[PDB]
């Protein structure tokens, strides 16, 4: 009758950096002191998030509405991204794409000129107390009718010949769909290759199928990989607490996870009404999906092998705490129907599993401790519900 899932500890993949979101206080309205520390505090009735992703404005003017949310992010404890929509307007030209006039790219003559640009971002960030952990070359070079386009040669002719350049890791290419022309240059391109950093992505569109990487698995070495970017399933207004849909967050992160080994998973707007905080600056049922992962999976913990999908409708991760070896285990449960699983981590000390459970109706919820029978954990999951054991 019973499905069975196992938990390998000694089969190591990625090591986990982190979860969060973006800021962009020229768009939107920046986040405020009580929502800063309700995204990046892991207390009681916070999300825990631990990356926070920022815009390099093209308007250098611009600079300083980033700093008070960014530093605040550091001090409790999260690291920082930034990425370009576009270039300065002194650096762009435009040309027809496709048949579409009047798209914009960096200038052939204007490559160092942007890595200026750039290292002027880092710069003035690191004077006010903000330390970017990375910068990425381009926002979305394969979507920008709305922003600045870059083939996968313009792109690699920037990572090969300019990036090393850049005083900070250098992100690339953040492909919409994680589009593998993107970033496959980059990949073959020994010096290219050397001056990557991190490896970023989107997920927008993105199947299951698109979400390994063959040529990442042998050439990244001493990368990271990141999903920076998606909302899923849409970002249709006052959408965040619709359930069911709110369990395909959880999928989605899941997915990136396991089907794709990505080390950090990033949304788009923390706070808005199809995202992770309301703007009543409460937790959202996609933010309780997100904090399933977020609050429990802290960076540095490491990912490892488990069986991710032992019947149908359940799919479960596993990570790693090696300073003391206990496992956090998150299991979604999408089925109307109850399911119970029998989770073997062989050779663990581990007896008791506490969990938290999300569903329409609770958020979060402590429920029974789980008891091992030496090293096996029976579970039964509830319907329609996200698990997180610790």
């Not at 980033?66 to 999260?78: C, D, N, P, Q, S």
């Not at 998150?330 to 999300?358: C, F, L």
Request: proline share 5%.
């Amino acid at each position: 009758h019973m499905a069975s899932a196992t938990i390998n500890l000694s089969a190591e993949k990625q090591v986990i950096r982190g979860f969060g979101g973006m800021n962009h206080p020229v768009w939107i309205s920046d986040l405020t002191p009580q929502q800063r520390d309700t995204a990046f505090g892991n207390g009681e009735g916070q999300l825990g998030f631990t990356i926070l992703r920022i815009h390099v404005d093209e308007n250098r003017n611009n600079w300083s509405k980033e700093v008070a949310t960014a530093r605040r992010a550091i001090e409790l404890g999260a690291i920082v991204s930034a990425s370009p929509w576009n270039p300065p307007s002194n650096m762009v030209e435009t040309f027809t794409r496709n048949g579409v006039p009047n798209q914009k790219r960096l200038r052939y003559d204007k490559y160092g000129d942007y890595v200026q640009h750039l290292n002027d971002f880092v710069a003035y960030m690191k004077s006010n107390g903000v330390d970017l952990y990375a910068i990425s070359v381009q926002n979305e070079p394969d979507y920008a009718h709305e922003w600045t386009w870059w083939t996968p040669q313009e792109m690699l002719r920037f990572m090969r010949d300019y990036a090393g350049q850049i005083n900070c890791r250098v992100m690339a290419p953040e492909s919409f769909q994680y589009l593998k022309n993107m970033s496959d240059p980059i990949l073959n391109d020994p010096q290219a290759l050397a001056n990557l950093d991190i490896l970023g992505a989107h997920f927008y569109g993105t199947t299951v199928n698109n979400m390994p990487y063959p040529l990442f698995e042998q050439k990244g070495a001493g990368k990271e990989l990141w999903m920076t970017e998606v909302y899923v399933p849409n970002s249709d207004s006052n959408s965040a607490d619709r359930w069911p849909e709110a369990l395909e967050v959880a999928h989605n992160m899941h997915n990136a996870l396991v089907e794709g080994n990505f080390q950090a998973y990033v949304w788009w707007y923390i706070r808005r009404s199809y995202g992770p905080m309301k703007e009543d600056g409460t937790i959202s049922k996609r933010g309780y999906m997100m904090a399933h992962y977020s609050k429990f999976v802290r960076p540095g913990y490491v990912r490892v092998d488990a069986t991710k999908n032992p019947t149908y409708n359940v799919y479960l991760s596993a990570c790693k705490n090696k300073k003391d070896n206990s496992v956090v285990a998150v299991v979604i449960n999408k089925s109307t129907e109850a399911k119970t699983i029998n989770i073997s981590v062989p050779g663990t000390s581990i007896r008791k599993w506490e969990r938290y459970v999300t569903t329409g109706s609770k958020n979060l919820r402590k429920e029974s401790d789980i008891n091992a029978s030496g090293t096996t954990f029976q579970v039964t999951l509830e319907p329609q519900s996200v698990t997180t054991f610790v």
